[PDB]
Amino acid sequence: MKQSSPTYLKHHFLIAMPHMADPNFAQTVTYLVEHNEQGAMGLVINRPSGLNLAEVLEQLKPDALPPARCQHIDIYNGGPVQTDRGFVLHPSGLSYQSTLELGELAMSTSQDVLFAIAAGTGPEKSLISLGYAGWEAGQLEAELSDNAWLTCPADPAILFDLPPEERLSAAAARLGVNLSLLTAQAGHA
Secondary structure, three states, X not given: OOOOOOOOOOOEEEEEOXXXXXXXXXXXXXXXXXXXXXXXXXXXXXXXXXXXXXXXXXXXXXXXXXXXXXXXXXEEEOOOEEEEEEEEEEOOOOXXXXXEEEOOEEEEOOHHHHHHHHHOOOOOOOEEEEEEEEEEOOHHXXXXXXXXXXXXXXXXXXXXXXXXXXXXXXXXXXXXXXXXXXXXXXXXX
């Protein structure tokens, strides 16, 4: 009996290749939330944003005032779809107003959960990423057949800890490359 679905891309990482006309986006990796023959949803997890939770909070509510907590919180780039909202992904099986369970992790798009977690009444750990990435019925299969976007298994640890550079390093680590000796970390000898 199988627990995880290795058949569908409803939780896999896509890697950008120089096979298309995208030289700027040729070095990004996306996380596929839900893959379907009629379309696919996923969040980009390799490009941190230069925004804080206070700004989104201010964009969400004009009469609301952001505290010291929001100022110390950053935003991540999720994709080109809906740049006016922030996505909230956590590793719990709990649900809110608009939450989709994805087994090892849940997805929350409710502003109420955003405020709740920011206050500390939401999930254990979350990811606030502005907008998502969406593919039309055939667009993904097109880029997949065109060798534009490669598909590979994923791990949430990379997504929750460091998806900016640790996504590239971990990706190589997933494929089977010794990135640790090429990059080398500073600490104890």
